[model samples]
Every structure is written in C-alpha cells, then in structure tokens.
Target: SMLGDVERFFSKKALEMRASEVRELLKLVETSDIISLAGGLPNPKTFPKEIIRDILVEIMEKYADKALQYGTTKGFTPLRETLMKWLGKRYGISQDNDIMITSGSQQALDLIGRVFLNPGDIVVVEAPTYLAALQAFNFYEPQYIQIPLDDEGMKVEILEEKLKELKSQGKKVKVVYTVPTFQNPAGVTMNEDRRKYLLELASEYDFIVVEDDPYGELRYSGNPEKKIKALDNEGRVIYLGTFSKILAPGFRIGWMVGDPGIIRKMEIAKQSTDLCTNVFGQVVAWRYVDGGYLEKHIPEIRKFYKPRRDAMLEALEEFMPEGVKWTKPEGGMFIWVTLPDGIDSKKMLERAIKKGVAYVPGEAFYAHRDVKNTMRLNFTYVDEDKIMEGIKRLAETIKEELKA
Candidate 1:
C-alpha cells in the first residue's frame, strides 16, 4: 500500500491537484437514473448541428489543408481578427490589446495562473467562485483572499477594506478573479457601478482583474451590462471568453484579451502546455462566426435554457420547505441555493444521491472549504420535465435533512 500510492515521490503541485466537484459527481450520476443538476452543461439540442454540418463540409472543401494542419500558438489569425472586430463593435473593447486562443476558457484560467501566480502571491476570488479556477490556481500556490458575493456580486467595500489592510501589512494582491456577469454557482452580476469601482480599485491597488465571461452572451433576461473589460481603459483587466457555452464545449475554443505583455507570456505558457488548441475547431468556429451562425443561434440557446430555469424556479417555489433561499439569475446556466444555516450541503449530498437527485455542494466552490449550506443548480443540461422532478427530489432531500 505504501508503494501503491507512489505519491511520496510526486511533486507538491501534483499532490495539490484537486478533482472538480462536478467531475467527481459526474461519475456518480453516469449510468444511473438520477436527474443531475450538478454540471454546467449546455443543452445538447441547443447546438447548431445542421449548421455545423454545413460548416464542416465548407471547411473540408475550402480549407481542409489548413484546418487539418497544426496552427501557431497564437491560434488562427482569421478567428482572432474576426473576434477583434466583433468584440470592438459589440462590447466597445478596444483593439489595442492582443488575443491568444486557448483549449478552452478553463485552459485560459490555468494559463493565467501559470503566467501571473507565484508562491505567496495573493489571489482574490469571490467567496463561492468558480471551483475550477481555484483548481487552476491551486498548483501555483497563491494565497486566496476571498470576498463574499451578494445578489449584486462581490462586495467591493469589503474588498477595499481587505486591500487596505493587506497594503498596510506590506503585502500586495496579484489578481482579483471574478465571473461578474451571470456568475457560476452564485448566478449574480456585478452592477455597472461595482464594475467601474472594481476597475478603479485595480488601478489603485495595482493588481490585475481576471474577468472570465463564458456566459455573457447566454442571457435569458435583463439588460446586458457593460463588460468590465469594455470599461477597462487601463488594460489591467484580462478578459476570458469561450465558444464552449456559445458554440459547443467539444470545440474547446476560448480566447484571452488583455495587455500584450501578459498575453505574450501566456502565449509562451501555451507553447509548453499544448502547443495550440486544435486547428480544426478554430476553423469551424471561424466559419460559425463569419457566417453569422453564432449570433443567430445565441437567442435559440437563451430560449432553450430560460424555460428550464423557469421550471426549476417554479418547482423550488412549489416544493421546497420554508427557510430555503436561492438566486434568480437573469442569465446563465446556474442557480445558487442557500439552505438553512443548520444544514451542511456536503454531508447532505450523500443523502441526496441516495434519493436519486444530485447537485454540486456549496463547499467545493469555497477556497477554504469553510461554508457548507449553499449549493449550485444547473438548469441547462437536463430536460425541463426532469428539472421539475429533480428539484422536487432535491427539496424533499433538504426537508429530510432538516428533520434529521
């Protein structure tokens, strides 16, 4: 058994690697009859299968050699140029910053940690932030300074207080990571005032703001807020976006826009990591955008998820016991729920799994694993009918947990 692990010889970073809560729960939900609300999977039906079929054929005939061949780490220039124009016109993101493609936004998260993090460097994140971002930055060994989020997103005043305290202690913050718009787990958006204030804080504190916006375009309700990057005149914000939510996850296409200095460093990191994201996907993605398929298809995706969100919300209202609370996300794939304080969501999950329903426990998103009464529910993957039964089961489980 001592030799079986062989972990004794492994690096601390390897030992530090943590499997995502969604990944672990995926194993349990697979091959079972359970209705899963765990992973942030886009509904498969929303993918433009017919459109992609056309693009595949188009790419095959017109650009087969280039599409199939290896590409530079900077990724396909045509995709970059198209993105630049689109981002500029739509979001008012200036074209002065450079772009680098990633395997996915997940890879961009890791690449960001790779380029910017050093041991003991302080990385600030939302209280129940994206767990995978925590996993990405884990290997780099930066100390996380978590700021809790409310319906309006991360408490900027709290962050400012912490910044002042940290500065007074002769320390510095390296990065402030946020999902801002339709945040994962919490499903909250940072208001325009907070977004501007965050950028001002970044300038004042001399720290980089890593704004990961995978679900920005997936809005089902509410007005679109100005992107933090769009307001980032100082270029201190590194904006990460993905085609996974928009196009399909399998394509694994994502991009980073920010100061070229950091972009170049991340490019070097990309070279050593995977050389480049798959060339074929980039070509297909380019066609998806250049042909106006993505713009037309996004509303379809919003339509698909909104009803599921509605079903879950309606189900929660009808079935859940008193004392339960949850977020009503304007857009995006997840709803964050908070149980009564006495309940620990992690411990309750086993009971939940036994009851034929599943969700990510709140603790997984916490950097310190200190909170346990919150959980994230995804409304995009499972069918609308399944979501009703799933929420009913989940609520029943919570009721049972409360009784015990």
Candidate 2:
C-alpha cells in the first residue's frame, strides 16, 4: 500500500500506532519449532466443529437468506435476544436493544474508544491489562492511570486514593476499565468487596466502569464472583462479553451491554467501522446457543484446559529457580511470572528463544513499560507436555541468568 513518501502524510495517531509487541513477537516464532507461550490463543480443541457444521447446514436450510444479508449495526436480533435470556441469567442484561454486537470484543473496544475517548481524557486501567485493549484505546489518545493488581485483583484502595487525589485537584475522571474475573495478564479476579467498593467509587466520582470480561466462564477452581455489571443498578457499568473464549474465536461475536444512550452513540459510530458484524457468524452462533450446545460445551472446554494450566503451574514449581515466582491463577490462560528485579525479561527473551520457547515479556503489558523482570505465560494454547517442556526450557534460562 505504500508508494512513495507516505510517511510524512500520516496522521500523528497513525505514526504513534505500532504493532503490538505480542503480535510482533508472535511473528518471530511463526516458522520455527519454538513452543510459543506468547500468544493469547484459545485451544482449538474447544471449538465444537461438529456442532458448527450442523449449525451451518441448518442456516442454509432455514436461515441462509437472512444470515447472509447485512444486518443492523445494533446486531442480530435473535442472537441479542438469546443473549438477553442467557446473559440475563448471569450478568443481568436488561433489554435486547441495550446490547450491541461488534465483530469481536476488539471492535467493541475500538468502538468504545471512538465514542468515549478524546485527547487528554483519563482512562484508568489495570497495571498489566490486556495489551490489545490498550492498543484499541490508544488510537483516541487518552491519558491512562494504571492501578496495580493483587491476588484479589485490582487494588481498588490505591485507585480510591488516586481518585480522591485527582478530585481534590479539580480533575474529572472519565472511565475505569477492568477485566475483573480471570484478568488477562494477572489471572486474578477482583474480590466482591473491591468490586462493590469500585462501583461506589464510580457513583461518587461520576465515572464509567468498563468491564471487559472474556475469560469469566473458564474457571478451573474457586467460586464464581458476581460481575460488576450485575451489581450495577446505575447505568454506569459497561459489560463486554464474547463467544471467543467459550465457543470459537473465528465466530467473532462479542456484545456490549451499556447505557442505551451509549449503545446508540456506538451504533452511530460503528456504521463507519465496518457497518455490521459478520451476519453469517451471528446466525451460526445464535443457532449454537439456541440449541443449548454452548451450555453443554462449557464443561468440555474447562476439562480440556484445566490440565494444561495445571501442567504449566506444576512445571513452573518444579523447575523455576529459588528467586523466581509466579501466580497460580485459579482460572484463565496466563500465569504471571516475576523474576528477581535484576533480571530483565526483555533481555531474557533472547536466551529463552534460543532455548526453543517464547513468552511475552510483561513490560509490554504495563502502561509505563518499565517493569522488565516479569513475563506472562499462556497455558491454554500449547499441549500439556509442550507447556511443561516450554516452562522447563524457560526455567533453565532463568536459572543460568541467576547463577551468572
């Protein structure tokens, strides 16, 4: 697409947007035999291929005309209605029209930024939030305030102090974004106490809380916590959910439940994004949910991934050096690893890759990108044996560095 001197013609935002470090690093291992724990990939074993084939046939026999036609920007009605009943049971989705389906949560993320972010707007995010969400929001150029996380999830107490500090300085907060349950990099869920306190803080400060949850259903152990959106009575919490983790990511079906006015604004904004999400995928997903297959498939998905996660944790425990430590996430694909502060994961990446394994250096996850001794290991994508071997290889590199 580049012809001549197109670089100078690019906008400031375009110049600032760089390839995601995770995505770029993914390219490094594409042709190699390297076992990559770098990708945020769901196991292909989770996709119900047989069921989707049946759904595709059903769509052709009964719903092809409608499924193939371009649908509303607000999204497919049957899918929305199905989610109204399905999500309503879990997250208390109020109305069908209140939900808008985007291509994926990525699109939903981008649409939110398109509608909400303006230069200098304040966006509060988890210290090591989902990197792509950061990428999505970065386009609109918002000022980020990172709140650190613990085993119990976001240190809302810290966020409260920061919020209070900002208020005293006469600054207005715009949004507080979180991936509360089984968060992306941290693998930690916000405790109920903190969730409620966060909402109370939101109401007190008049800010929107965007709950971007994609891994809520993939619990390996621990009791399910109530969603922040479910606890929300005021129209302040925006809930984003997707079938990517549960069903198949290729379906690209994700919905956002927010204030009707906000949904309207996003709908108007989305017309320019892609006009509408994939109608064909919508029909197939609706069919999958309507037939109760999605519900039946959850236990299978969990069954497939639990052992893989268990394998990774066990490997880390067995092989890691004394100074190295990592999180044991009850659920979610990642286990956050923290090496001794003197070890820079970005520097360590060279050694790890040479050892035939790869992981995302946690520095890329931080808004500040200054924490360099940590890494995020994805457990769900690789086989149990490969996950173990990858960790063992990764461990050797860490041990060698520590010994040095």
Candidate 3:
C-alpha cells in the first residue's frame, strides 16, 4: 500500500470539491423525525404519478425497438424539435436558437463549465446563489465576484459598478450566472425592470449570462415574468431549464438553450461524454410535452405547491426571532434566511438536527470560504405541520445561540 501510494487521485481539478451540503445533510435526518428544509426536492405526493405511469405504458407499446436501441448523442431529435416548438411558443424565442439536452441542469452546468471556464476566469454570481452550481464550477478555480442584492432581486447598480471596477483593473470576467425566477437559496424573483437592466448590462459588458430556471413554471403566486432568455437578442445568455422540479427528479432530464455557436461546441462535449440521455425517458418526455399533458399538469403542480409556500411564510412570521430575516418567495421551494449578527447557522445546525430538523448552511451557497450566517429552507417535501415544527426548532436553535 505504501509503495503504490497514489498521489491526489482527484486529477488536479477534482481535488478542489466535495458533495453538496444539502445532500450530505440528508443523512442526519434518518434517525430522527427530522423535518428537512434542505435540498430542492419536489414533493412526491404532488407529482403527476398517474400521468407518468400512463406515458410509460404507452412508450413500451408504441416504440418498443427504438426505446431499447442506442440513439444519437444530440438526444432524440424529435424531443429537441418538440422542445424548440414549445420554447418558441412560450417565450417567443426563435426556433433557430440552438439547444442541447442534458441529464439534468447539473450536466448542463458541467458542460457550460467545460466550454467556457478557462483556468482563472472570474465568474460573477449573486451573494447567495445555487450551491450545486458553485460546486460544479469549483474545479475550474475561477475567482467568484459576489454581487450584492436587495428585495427587487440582484442589484443591477451594484453589478454594473462592480463590472466597471473589474474592467478598470483589466480583468476579463467569463460569465454571470443568475436564477432570475424563484432563485435557489434566495427565493426572490427578479422584477421586470431589473430583468431588462441585467440584460442591458450583459449586452454592454459582453459576458456570458447563464439564466438557470427550474422553477419558472411553478409560479404559485402572481402573474409570471418573462424569462431573460426570451428577451436575449444578442445571444449572450445561456438558458438552463429542467424537468426535475416539475416532473420528477428521478428522470434527470434538462436542457440548455442558447446561440448555435456555443451549443455546437457543447454538443461535441456531450458526444464524448455519455453519448446520449436515456432513450425511453426521452420518448416519454417528448410525448408528455407534445401530447397536451403538460398544459394540464402545470396548473395542477401550482395548486399543490401554493399551500406549502403559504405555510412556510406564515410559520416564519409566527416563529422566527425578531432579528432573523427571511424571504417570502412567490413560487419556488426554498426560503432564504439570514441569521442576526453574530449568529452562526453552521454551528447551530448540530442542535437543530438534535431537535429533529435539518437545513443547509448558508456558506455552502457562497463561492468564497467565509462563514455566512444564512441558511436555505425548502417547504415543498414536508407537510404544513412539519414545516412549522422545523422552522420553530431552527428558530429556537437561533435563539439559543443568541442567548449564549
């Protein structure tokens, strides 16, 4: 064993990262009746299980040979074509706009990292962004510039000012990643004015914009806002979409829509990887989307999630401490909370876990290594009663820390 001692087997890049915090936190909940407010997992009770079962039977009966055989790496063309038509209709984006299917948005993020992130390139991300995306890009070793934000969403003024400062020093930032609608950790959706301004900045600065939207269709509150990808005329934004939140994460299907040039390059990357996503799954997804099923499924999903969102918002208002601040997201599953000054959520997690509750620490969402007195809570999977209990337990943990 000593003679064959392998040096860092992580292959230089792999040495920099670890598994997601929310995923790892799930283990802690097994022994207790832990009400989990971590991980963006959709509620199983609300999924269109009957529809999926019907689609599965249809796939087997209809396309027996095609479902089993190996397909092209570009994904089932019919599915992509259907998706393009849907995209055009929904967002008014051109059919000419390029697209590629991925295992999920996770694969899309990895592919984006592969194509754009050169060693040492700087990425501009919101202060608290998607933790998994942050982890995916970690191997590239890019400097992360955290843009400050407020209620309206990621502050355009702060972003523009920071961009000017970076350019003044002759720095070349690679991409700006944003979850414009129902953002991951911070569940705030960017307003229309901010959306328009962010695009203007992207156009002016000439950097890639990755607009990740897994929750766009899950709008449980007011009227939906237009996606940044819909407005992107200059091809600066790489739009990431997923079926995980809406359908089932078990399918692991997602896509990236962007300009042809970039998507073309990503296609090559995909071909060398798994060759293609699950063929049967593709057929099922295609049929569901094109067979008038999605039209009925979406509204059903909204009705299911609306009550959970309401429950979490009400619970936080009743249970959280005066100093603890949190976001009341309109549609998304997550609730972002910032602990009062001098509070350490990372430390408080142990006691919270002991009290049969679990949540992801805020620092996991940060690109920088500094401790963040914040945490992300998900109310989708748990029922209303458990959500209240979980938040109450977490809030009590915070109170104990403050008292100490």
RMSD per model, one decimal: 1.6, 1.5, 1.8
Each prediction's TM-score against the native?
A: 0.97, 0.97, 0.95
lDDT agreement with native, every candidate: 0.91, 0.88, 0.83
Our model 3 lands, by Cα RMSD against the true structure, at 1.8
> What is the overall TM-score of model 2 with all chains considered together?
0.97
Best candidate, lDDT-wise? 1
**In candidate 3, what are the lDDT values of residues 119-188, reduced to their tens digit?**
7899999878887798788767778998866766798789989999998999867899998888898989
lDDT of 2: 0.88
Error at 261, model 2, angstroms: 1.0
lDDT of 1: 0.91
Ranking by lDDT: 1, 2, 3
- Residues 192-306 of candidate 1 have per-residue lDDT tens digits of 9999999999999999999999999989889999999999999899999999988999999999999999999999989988988999999998999888998899889998888
Better of 2 and 3 by lDDT: 2
Model 3 ranges off by over 4 Å = 1-4, 8-10, 19-25
- Candidate 2: which stretches are off by over 4 Å? 20-22, 95-97
